[PDB]
Design a binder for this molecule. Structure first.
Ligand SMILES: [Zn+2]
Ligand SMILES: [Zn+2]
Ligand SMILES: [Zn+2]
Ligand SMILES: [Zn+2]
Lengths: 73, 73
DNA sequence: CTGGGAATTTCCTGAT
DNA sequence: ATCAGGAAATTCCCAG
């Protein structure tokens, strides 16, 4: 396997239970330790990839959870 | 008793031809000045308000133009 | 070798 | 024209 399950960018390994890129790894860590205030300006279907992942942390965090990312993994 | 024509936040006056808040004023200036290629992660229909205006500069910039904001005014 | 996490840098936004 | 808070992504060091 390769290709991070969140943003489809090249994956650096298995992080918090899921194959992800380095950027999504630290994003999830930040989001989960913080209070995740995030609001989607769209329909919560936003495209998350290398280009657009910065746009919507709401949808990015959702895709992190849906992929099964968790801290104790 | 009047609001920014872009994000609906309290308007500070008439900026670049349109009633806007200070934040949308400097955003627009920076956007035109700034080479920026913006990409919406959504449908280009994004909700732009006080909180969500940070999410999508693409739709924010579009709303600036649609409202009639221009450096010539 | 693996992955967690701190540190660092850069960028965006908004106020002064 | 600064300046500061925040988010983002890389670099680096840690334990295993
Ligand atoms: Zn990713
Ligand atoms: Zn979204
Ligand atoms: Zn505004
Ligand atoms: Zn948008």
């Amino acid at each position: 396997p390769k290709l991070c399950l969140v943003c489809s960018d090249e994956a650096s390994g298995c992080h918090y239970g899921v194959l992800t890129c380095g950027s999504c790894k630290v994003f999830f860590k930040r989001a989960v330790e913080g209070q995740h205030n995030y609001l989607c300006a769209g329909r919560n279907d936003c495209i998350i990839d290398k280009i657009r992942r910065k746009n919507c942390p709401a949808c990015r965090y959702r895709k992190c959870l849906q992929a099964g990312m968790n801290l104790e993994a």
